[PDB]
């Protein structure tokens, strides 16, 4: 069952810091793809991840297309990642644009959390866009108190979400100016990040971030509970992202 007859590569989309990501078009049917390509130990570690994605079939999570070196064919999303969008446009996202992403993310998180799965790498570079204006998420008594805590556990996502929303408002996440070494300390030491210009955004945004970014995963809310927040409870149209995908395409056409 050799590949290359099935798919033909027709582009490169981004050498991240994990393999390289190329664009693939089906030889028979004509369909597009994203091909992630790698080449004992690691191989079985990747198979588990692949077989986890097959399971995670939902509107707002990339579809697994196949598995043939090591090829992984995932759905082409022709808007690309939101962080790439934000630079090509050289600006943040409008609150209504942020409202639509926050809500679609929450349905993806709430889905995953019912499957007992965490994402753990939620940032703007892992929120992809379709032309339709929709997102896809990508890729015992002698025990010491601190050992106990590190054995609710899926509230990690909910923190990354609120942090992703700041990334989208402001282009850059909080503490972007310090090196990765010092970040971890700043995270653990500092109070929950707020928006830089509280004046610029609605009272609902500020409060959503207030409750999303609780340092205590006990008192911190589920994807489910957050879906009833005013900030995302009234959101029925993907218009504002339909709008934003259009500009991005237009801006990209420039030469
Ligand atoms: C600079 N202009 C805007 C960004 N540009 C762009 C265009 C299409 C793109 N598709 C993907 C993509 C993934 N990166 C991807 C992944 F990383 C993991 C799993 C599935 C994926 N599917 C994709 O469809 N990125 C794109 C970027 C290049 C042109």
Pick from 56, 76, 96: which residue ends a domain?
Answer: 76
Q: What is the CATH number of the domain that holds 118?
A: 1.10.510.10
Question: Do residue 71 and residue 92 come from a single domain?
Answer: no
Report the distance separating Cα 145 and Cα 223, nearest Å.
Answer: 28
For the chain, how many structural domains are there in total? 2
Question: Do residue 45 and residue 108 come from a single domain?
Answer: no
Sheet with 32-38: strands ordered across:
7-14, 20-26, 32-38, 70-74, 64-67
- Domain span at 40: 1-76
| PDB resolution in Å | 2.7
Q: Are 167 and 85 in contact (CB under 8 A)?
A: no
Pick from 51, 76, 101: which residue ends a domain?
Answer: 76
Q: What is the CATH number of the domain that holds 9?
A: 3.30.200.20
Report the distance separating Cα 208 and Cα 89, nearest Å.
Answer: 26
Report the distance separating Cα 116 and Cα 98, nearest Å.
Answer: 26
- 127 marked among binding-site residues: no
Question: Do residue 156 and residue 58 come from a single domain?
Answer: no
Report the distance separating Cα 169 and Cα 207, nearest Å.
Answer: 15
What's the CA-to-centroid distance between 81 and ligand 1, angstroms? 6
Question: Do residue 26 and residue 87 come from a single domain?
Answer: no
Q: What is the 3-state secondary structure (H, E, C) of the chain?
A: CCCCCCEEEEEEEECCCCCEEEEEEECCCCCEEEEEEECCHHHHHHHHHHHHHHHCCCCCECCEEEECCEEEEECCCCCEEHHHHHHHCCCCCCHHHHHHHHHHHHHHHHHHHHCCCCCCCCCHHHEEECCCCCEEECCCCCCCHHHHHCCCCCCHHHHHHHHHHHHHHHCCCCCCCCCHHHHHHHHHHCCCCCCCCHHHCCHHHHHHHHHHCCCCCCCCCCHHHHHCCHHHHCCCCCHHHHHHHHHHHHHHCCC
Tokens of 241: 């992202």
What's the CA-to-centroid distance between 129 and ligand 1, angstroms? 9
Report the distance separating Cα 197 and Cα 182, nearest Å.
Answer: 24
Angle value at C-alpha 113, between 160 and 221, nearest 5 degrees: 55
- 13 marked among binding-site residues: yes
What technique was this entry resolved by?
Answer: X-ray
Pick from 43, 76, 109: which residue ends a domain?
Answer: 76
Question: Do residue 72 and residue 173 come from a single domain?
Answer: no
């Amino acid at each position: 069952l050799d590949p290359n007859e099935v798919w033909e590569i027709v582009g490169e989309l981004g050498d991240g810091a994990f393999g390289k990501v190329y664009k693939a078009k089906n030889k028979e049917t004509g369909a597009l793809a994203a091909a992630k390509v790698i080449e004992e130990e690691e191989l079985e570690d990747y198979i588990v991840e692949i077989e986890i994605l097959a399971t995670c079939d939902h509107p707002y999570i990339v579809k697994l297309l196949g598995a043939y070196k090591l090829w992984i064919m995932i759905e082409f999303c022709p808007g690309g990642a939101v962080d790439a969008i934000m630079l090509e446009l050289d600006r943040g996202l409008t609150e209504p644009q942020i409202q639509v992403v926050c809500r679609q993310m929450l349905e993806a998180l709430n889905f995953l959390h019912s499957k007992r799965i965490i994402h753990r790498d939620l940032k703007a570079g892992n929120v992809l866009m379709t032309l339709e204006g929709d997102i896809r998420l990508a890729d015992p008594y002698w025990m010491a108190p601190e050992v106990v805590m590190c054995e609710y556990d899926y509230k990690a996502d909910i923190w990354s979400l609120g942090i992703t929303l700041i990334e989208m408002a402001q282009i850059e996440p909080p503490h972007h100016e310090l090196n990765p070494m010092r970040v971890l300390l700043k995270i653990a030491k500092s109070d929950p990040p707020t928006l830089l210009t509280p004046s610029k955004w609605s009272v609902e945004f500020r409060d959503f971030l207030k409750i999303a970014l609780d340092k205590n995963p006990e008192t911190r809310p589920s994807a489910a509970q957050l879906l009833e927040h005013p900030f995302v409870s009234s959101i029925t149209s993907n218009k504002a992202l339909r709008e934003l995908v259009a500009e991005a395409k237009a801006e990209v056409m420039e030469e």
